[model samples]
Target: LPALIDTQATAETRALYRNLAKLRYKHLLFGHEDSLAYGVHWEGDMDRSDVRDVTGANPAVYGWELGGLELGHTANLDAVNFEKMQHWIKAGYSRGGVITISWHVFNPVSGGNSWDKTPAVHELIPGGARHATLKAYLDTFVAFNEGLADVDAQGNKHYPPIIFRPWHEHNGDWFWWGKGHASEQDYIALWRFTVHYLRDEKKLRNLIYAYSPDRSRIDMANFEAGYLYGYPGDAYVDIIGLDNYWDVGHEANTASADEQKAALTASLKQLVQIARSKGKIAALTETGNNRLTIDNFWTERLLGPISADADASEIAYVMVWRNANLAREKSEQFFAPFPGQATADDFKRFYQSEVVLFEDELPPLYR
Candidate 1:
């Protein structure tokens, strides 16, 4: 079995780490960000998911965000409340679905949002001017994570294991922690600090740390090195994650579907290769065409790359971004399909495919 970053990790956390690798070789699990907390045309409805409305079942994994939490906000960057996020985490757990987390922490030095490229990462490291501020932010995170628990009939608390991916997309300059804003050394130090603080100092053993970089903008033509740029170390991470949006069906890319799928498959193969070498698991941590303008994107574009290449298909899971309500946003800001969307039919077919695991198809991952 692959070892966890935390040797003393909870039994469920250890089991989840091992099973993720095992399950990936068999089937690729599908996930959706904010699937339960809210969805297209709705917000905070109990036991609701746009995926379920379209496919008759929820995704195999549920992805949550922690962006505004660093500033002690009641809700995330998308306005999903922290209390509701906790409820959704437990809901996904009880229903045998996996939970993954992403953090878009605010820029500490500049007091800007995550996308504000203000060069704040250097100040986040130990002994830096704003290191103490970052520590306090992490304390809030720890409290929230520790509160993700359930009381059993025996009255003992059971903390659900969470796959936590923080400071993702670092290979790109879109976010504060991305390239051009933070030096590689400072980035690595920040990663090590966060992991050590959570796993070693705080003793939050329910977390499985994931390291994700954007689609190799920063290749086997230095692909491995490019993808692994700013990697803290093997000891600090449990999952190898890649967030690819441009390759799938990003509106900016006018490449033919065949060309796009070919590039995506090559990247997936490379991603899996690196993970296998380290005895860890690989995942499509964050991906989706904005608004999903491609009618057949779910199957022809997204699923084609994974299904066509055996090596690429070994990925553990693929998580698309959340569905923003049209009325509130006043724009076509959605990723996953709801009923009547152009890609809904294709999404249903993708959900039905034997190789794509949904909520009902998952095995006892924690066992």
Candidate 2:
């Protein structure tokens, strides 16, 4: 019943606003400004413009926020900028935006892409300098949001905290934080430490943790790898997310429309079943088609069934990765763009259909 309309990128641009309006989406998740603009070193001292760039334009889609902070291996916790965050919270736009953090921490000393390599190789201990660094990260996280005691222009104080998703997509080994990078124990311990630090130190009560794994590695073994790193118990996690891209070629050895839809539907069904068994909320954290696939895959596969599924009715949100770099190339083959082979009408039809959910309206199951 909790349908979330999601998008990436700052909502300030007219084209993005038009796209959202056409899609009838309400919820949004964004990143890249702080990371791409500032670089990996600007964790704690992010510019206020980053937050303002997002919240200033689209205050309505305030349900979730992603990629505000940089926590990769090269970055340390001391780099967080709480002052700018406090500014956003004080600016009448904090109540709805939930922060989502991503982790790709690789230990440069150990020649691996994980914090665990520091410990197992006798380079670091659990409560040693590594732990201290982690504590600082959480401390800064809590300090920034907790310090915002002042009211916004609209008098809204005590904004809800963010949903933390660390070391996501463990199923994929390409990233430094992926499964092959470290042992399972190290990963789980890192997750527990993060959750404990945030809850105990930051006193963050509004946080809803999400566990997301990539779908490309959805075999039984890889699925277990996604859950292997650690679990913060039911009390800590609120949703289970999956980063999946439809491999249309997998179904029919070609990217036909039917093959794309079938592949996506089957994957969603499988994910829903898994979430149902665990009593967890399911969501599509990242989804998109390759530039080589057919057109309108988002509309044909994602929207249609989400608006109609019965057992998978509990699925909450679906966030599309609208990277402008890939927009033209990918859409040229698969996704529809304005004035191209794919037109605005394709977008409009999908958004206007009963399948997609928007602000002020729930999906069929929610009703």
Candidate 3:
């Protein structure tokens, strides 16, 4: 699946995905939120032995946000300029880590959150009123990515391929392109439009698209029922990912941890099967127990099912959300453990396990 992993990227980009897919079964990359961003570091401070900074190993799979690359600032989500993106992406790439970019590109019509449906789904299809708006944003998007090639201190240029995940977690209606916010076929057309614009029109070759419709473990029939309605054909997607969060402590402690684990395993198993069918890779792209209040949440709640479930080891990487410092704005809840946090030891144990793979352990796929 090397060349087939990403139709638009180069051989080296495909090689990284191919290598990741092959190594998936034996070990999966333990990703954390915004491991590289302008504002955040491993765990608020880069020097601390906090969960992410501890053990001297960053996540092999580093998550990034493209919320404001097209524009210098954004109200839709967190913002960063292209220089910041290049800095972090190259920093991670230098360490043999992979990059995944999630976009919170705001509402095309009203310029609000992606969840705002002002322009409506129909307006995003080609030749629609808001179609030109998308083009304008993508024009800058193209420019931002077109020059992501990194240069060493001595002046070496090694361009990086971006694992671009636009309109993620679409099974929910939180985003404008999601299930309830748009028609079945309209969202498909939207996805097709975006990919065509970026790869074909703008000629942005470093992009590798990911199509993720939120759903869980079940037979293929049920899986197809949930995500396939808006599939947009295989040409548009390089990876098939799932964003299933543990609802246990978030909603009610009445929820059984094992049930959440079973649900997670089931999703991973089906995601792997579905990805294999498409000759693509499967990833637990985004997940975590909200607040991470459970002491052993990392091992028992998250890792246990993934380790025990049959064939679920095929998932390429699983990423938890960021560890925002509480002193910062809206830091009441965070995902990963901080240096002296309650779950730090449990997370340390998770880090020590052979199954969990981080940056230092990763092979020089891109190197």
Candidate 4:
């Protein structure tokens, strides 16, 4: 995915970028971030700086939060900047990491965060009165993406490919774009317009689009109905992703740990099959056991079933959320392990397996 006017990696390495476009890696790329410290992973940026320190080397895919494209400033904990984000994308893509970003847009109507569903999603679609406001957000995103193909410190212009996912978790009713909040037609219009405006109108070529909905465990007919309900169309999407978070403290313990594993396994199975039928890459875009309560979460609870299932294991990449070390952050926080955390050793074991592919072991691949 080299850009039209290049400068990030090297003219000579441009050949290597085409090598990446072939998507030749046989194993999935590991993904993570130690926050945007130093504008990339590793170094003093994170207390658990290096993956190999806990039997890790590097991540194959890097997940970032794009929660602020609209306001130019994010209100959530992600607290990131556009310049640093572009720099981080360049740093990872230069070394062969996939860039995938998830956006949690603040509700345009209610003035609340992404969780706000008050206005029933009227303002965001193509013909809505507030569509201009949505366009402004896309305008900022496109402007930033144009700069994404920027020159790194060495002055080689790079056009790093990206997996951009917005309006995620549509199956859940908590967000404005979710199941009950918007008609399937309106959602479809919003999705297609977003893609058409960005790709055709905006002429942004470095992006590979992904469509993701959170796991809701509905029946196949209803789930499939909702699954493809707002789908923009195959031509607009390059990847099929899912966001499923384990509810740690929700229900009584009567639900066995095996049940949760079964849920993930089955959900991923559905996603893989859906991708197979649709001719697109499948990915576990977002997943985590909240608070790390399940000590063996990685070795057994999460990877055990995924490792056992040949199909689920074939996903391009999987990612856990960032490890925010803020002292004021609640005990309910933490998706990935920090140094000396209870699950660090378990994550190390997960990292050491050949089943997992970190940066050191990666080959070039893109959407």
Give per-model TM-scores: 0.97, 0.62, 0.89, 0.83
Worst 10 residues of 4 by lDDT: 1-10
| Candidate with maximal TM-score | 1
Ranked candidates (TM-score, high to low): 1, 3, 4, 2
Q: lDDT of all predictions, in order shown?
A: 0.88, 0.45, 0.70, 0.66
Candidate 3 CA-lDDT value? 0.70
Q: For candidate 2, write residues 72-175 as lDDT tens digits.
A: 22223323343543454444233333234444444535544454434431122265455555564455556555565546688855443344566677656665
lDDT string, candidate 1, 1-367, tens digits: 7789899988888888888878888698999998987677887578899999999999999999999898989998888899989988998998889999999998887788998898888888998888998789899888898778778899977888999999888989999988899999999999999998988889888999999998848453678889889998899888899989878877677878777789899889989998889888899998998877887888888888887888898899999999987666777788899899888999999999888999998899888
Evaluate residue 95 in candidate 4 and report its C-alpha lDDT on the 0 to 100 scale. 73
**Can you write out model 4's per-residue Cα lDDT over 1-367, one digit (the tens) per residue?**
3222223323433443344323323455567653333222233343233344555465677777766667767333355556667777778777776777777777887767888777646777777899898899889787777766767699865577777888887877888788788887888888888888887777665666778887653454455565675778877676788876642222343557777677667777777778767766677787776557777878887777776576776567777667554543433455666656688898888887776777777754542
For model 3, the superposed segments whose C-alpha errors exceed 4 Å read 2-8, 38-51, 74-76, 79-82, 151-157, 216-221, 247-249, 252-254
Off by over 4 Å in 1: 153-155, 216-220
lDDT of 3 by residue, 220-246 (tens): 347656766677888788788877774
Error in Å for residue 15 of model 3:
1.4
2 against 3, candidate with superior TM-score: 3
* Model with the higher lDDT, candidate 2 or 3: 3
Off by over 4 Å in 2: 1-125, 144-157, 220-232, 247-260, 290-293, 305-308, 322-343, 359-367
TM-score of 3: 0.89
